Amino acid sequence: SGFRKMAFPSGKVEGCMVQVTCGTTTLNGLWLDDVVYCPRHVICTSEDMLNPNYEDLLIRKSNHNFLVQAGNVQLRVIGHSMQNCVLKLKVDTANPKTPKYKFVRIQPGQTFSVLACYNGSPSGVYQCAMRPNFTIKGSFLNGSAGSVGFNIDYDCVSFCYMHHMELPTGVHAGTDLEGNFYGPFVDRQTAQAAGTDTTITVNVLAWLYAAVINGDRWFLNRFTTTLNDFNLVAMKYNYEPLTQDHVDILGPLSAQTGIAVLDMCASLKELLQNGMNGRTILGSALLEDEFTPFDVVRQCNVATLQ
Amino acid sequence: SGFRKMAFPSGKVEGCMVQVTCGTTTLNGLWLDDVVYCPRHVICTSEDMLNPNYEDLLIRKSNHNFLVQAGNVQLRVIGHSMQNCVLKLKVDTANPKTPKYKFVRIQPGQTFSVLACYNGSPSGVYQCAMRPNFTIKGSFLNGSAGSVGFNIDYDCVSFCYMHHMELPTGVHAGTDLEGNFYGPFVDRQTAQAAGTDTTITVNVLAWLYAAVINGDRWFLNRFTTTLNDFNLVAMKYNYEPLTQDHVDILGPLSAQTGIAVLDMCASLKELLQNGMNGRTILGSALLEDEFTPFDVVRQCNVATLQ
Ligand code: NA
């Protein structure tokens, strides 16, 4: 029993973090095989960071300008490549702790674990949802760029996020491991705003299924809705529209509870319109939206064969 | 920026986690040097678990009865003994990944990270506080016993919790690494109840101070209270009574912010009675009590030298 936002175990990732210093700017890199991946603004001065021309800045850098440290071992940089907003530093040594891994680009409403690092050294780990406005509500201080987000499936680490920056509102923006930003953001110190965040509807529905399984079911009703009619109400209340892809991932919970997705949608719709009127769901007056259908099935209480 | 319930990186603990099987009963063990620590109820059949005489049940077990797997490597048990509620299985191979470590008994109110494991495979990591009633509100399913709780101090792992059971309320109970239960619980399937789960008042207050440093102080007011009249309200809401000693603990944060502890108490009193009115504090719509007075400032935003 018990619902907790858990991160995946971070060990396979810890053995890949290094420190990357380019002159008087430092951040973290990810060391896989003989390549170290890091945010390209490691080549900037603080002044450069206002309006960098990264191609012009990189021309002035040589392999010797990059100092890469794996604990107490210096790795010699033998080539470098800018790819979108990440730098790929080829080093003379393959990382012996390289896990089986892939790079994947995640979608809003999906979760991943963040390993926050400073100076190449892992600091803490926590679970994030990619918000519909393509920011994450992380915890990140100066020097944390190059920290990565990931999911783990058996032994295979799927890297999906590299941290780059913090917006004026205190939320966080980064790239996938190919170096393309999530969202409309750029790695310059300019006045950028993230769009209005919206509630991740599929995750609230998963939460509601979890509530039913644990016996909390006052909010169920006998009403019917089309998906388009439900989505019109969702958009009014700044909830994300439910897609067929969301309906697919709610399949197992629907099957195990016998509540069709569109019936649980009609139940949510009444919640949005009428509020919760002093009732609670799973012991809270607020609807959770960062437990995915996968999270819910993994942690939900289960039947007991007696 | 950002404020998150963060756990320590779990890599140093992942390398210690093994599966222990005795008959058809399996759970996790902690492999340090040539010893595996696990909950003693691995020797029970399910029917044994109701009212076990552990001494009698252990007498009928031999070394050969314990199967230990570290990944694909089988670890043969070459001695065994019981210590309170844990077993120490001596194995033929010292763990080459043993970190620097110690066993420590934490206090109610203190925090620790949990590496939840099943079949000796680490599954997830999250941060918990030892509740005033000596329970933990974690996410644990069948087969998670033997999962451990820990803090990391640079390179040294302080193991402080080993998981054993779930009470009828869904809350979790366990032991230190010498096998002594936190709280009055016993490792048998009986009708046990924990004491009242109170909110950790000193932790909420430290969090309010961290809020002020970050710039959330909409809850600050000009009112002040005495310790007694605060505790009147505290008991009404099942907050721990605030002692003068707790008041002393908050001295440093009080000096950091210029805010008298009893003035912060006045703000907390008003928040308890009137709620937050749709405002949040450090991104939370609830009063957070899982951050210790030392831990809270580490995530605060800092001054920027311009
Ligand atoms: Na600088």
Three-state SS annotation for A68-118: EEECCEEECEEEEEEECCEEEEEECCCCCCCCCEEECCCCCCCEEEEEEEE
Query: What span, in angstroms and rounded, lies between the C-alpha atoms of A304 and A282?
Result: 21
Residue contact A4–B138, C-beta within 8 A: yes
Tokens of A236: 């009014």
Which residue has tokens 């032994």?
A155
Q: Rg of chain B's alpha carbons, rounded to an integer? A: 22
Which residue has tokens 């003379």?
A92
Tokens of A24: 């008087």
Angle at A163 between CA B5 and CA A43, to 5 degrees: 140
Query: What span, in angstroms and rounded, lies between the C-alpha atoms of B186 and A118?
Result: 42
Among B62, B25, B67, B21, residue whose Cα is nearest residue B44 = B25
Resolution (A): 2.0
Name every chain B residue with its beta carbon within 8 A of the beta carbon of A276.
none
Beta carbons of A149 and A117 less than 8 angstroms apart: no
The DSSP bridge pattern shows strands A156-166 and A101-103 to be parallel
Distance, first Cα to last Cα, chain A: 18
**Best of B3, B10, B13 to disrupt the A interface by mutation (most A CBs within 10 Å)?**
B10
Phi/psi of residue B246, nearest 5 degrees? -60, -40
Tokens of A97: 């702790």
Q: What is the largest CA-CA distance in chain B?
A: 72
Query: What span, in angstroms and rounded, lies between the C-alpha atoms of A267 and A259?
Result: 10
In three-state form (DSSP H/G/I as H, E/B as E, the rest C), the secondary structure along chain B is CCCCCCECCCHHHHCCEEEEEECCEEEEEEEECCEEEEEHHHHCCCHHHHCCCHHHHHHCCCHHHEEEEECCEEEEEEEEEEECCEEEEEECCCCCCCCEEEECCCCCCCEEEEEEEECCEEEEEEEEECCCCCCECCCCCCCCCCCEEEEEECCEEEEEEEEEEECCCCCEEEECCCCCECCCCCCCCCCCCCCCCCECHHHHHHHHHHHHHHCCCCCCCCCCCCHHHHHHHHHHCCECCCCHHHHHHCHHHHHHHCCCHHHHHHHHHHHHHHCCCCCCECCECCCCCCCCCCCHHHHCCCCCCC
Taking the C-alpha atoms of B165, B170, B171 and B176 in order, what is their torsion angle to the nearest 10 degrees? 10
List b or e across A130-142, with b for residues whose CB sees 16 or more CB atoms inside 10 angstroms: bbbbbbbbbbbbe
Which residue has tokens 């016998």?
A258
How many Cβ atoms from other residues are within 10 Å of residue B277's Cβ? 8
Q: Residues 18-47, chain A: which have Cβ within 8 Å of B?
A: none
Query: What span, in angstroms and rounded, lies between the C-alpha atoms of B143 and B19?
Result: 10
Torsional sign, CA A246, A250, A252, A254: negative
- Who surrounds ion ligand 1 at CB < 5 A? A 46
Beta carbons of A121 and A151 less than 8 angstroms apart: no
Q: What Å distances lie between residue B11 and A19, A54, A148, B198, CA to CA?
A: 18, 35, 15, 33
Among B41, A119, B299, residue whose Cα is nearest residue B288 = B299
Helix (H, G, I), strand (E, B) or coil at A282: coil
User: Within an 8 Å CB–CB cutoff, is residue B283 touching chain A?
Assistant: yes
How many Cβ atoms from other residues are within 10 Å of residue A57's Cβ? 17
Query: What span, in angstroms and rounded, lies between the C-alpha atoms of B10 and A159?
Result: 17
Tell me the residue type at B74.
Q
Q: Tell me which chain B residue has its CA closest to the CA of residue A47.
A: B306
Among B250, B152, B138, residue whose Cα is nearest residue B203 = B250
Query: What span, in angstroms and rounded, lies between the C-alpha atoms of A75 and A18?
Result: 10
Torsional sign, CA B277, B280, B284, B290: negative
Beta carbons of B38 and B89 less than 8 angstroms apart: yes
Tell me the residue type at A17.
M
Beta carbons of B186 and B192 less than 8 angstroms apart: yes
- Alpha helix segments (H runs only) across A146-220: 201-213
Residue contact A125–B10, C-beta within 8 A: yes
User: Within an 8 Å CB–CB cutoff, is residue B124 touching chain A?
Assistant: yes
Beta carbons of A40 and A85 less than 8 angstroms apart: yes
Cα–ligand 1 centroid distance for A24 (angstroms)? 6
Phi/psi of residue A225, nearest 5 degrees? -145, 145
User: Within an 8 Å CB–CB cutoff, is residue B147 touching chain A?
Assistant: no
Q: For A6, which of B11, B116, B286 is closest by C-beta distance?
A: B116
Query: What span, in angstroms and rounded, lies between the C-alpha atoms of B161 and B85?
Result: 12
Strands, DSSP E only, in A167-252? 172-175
Query: What span, in angstroms and rounded, lies between the C-alpha atoms of A257 and A207?
Result: 13
Beta carbons of B8 and B150 less than 8 angstroms apart: yes
Closest-CA distance, A226 to chain B, in angstroms, reads 31
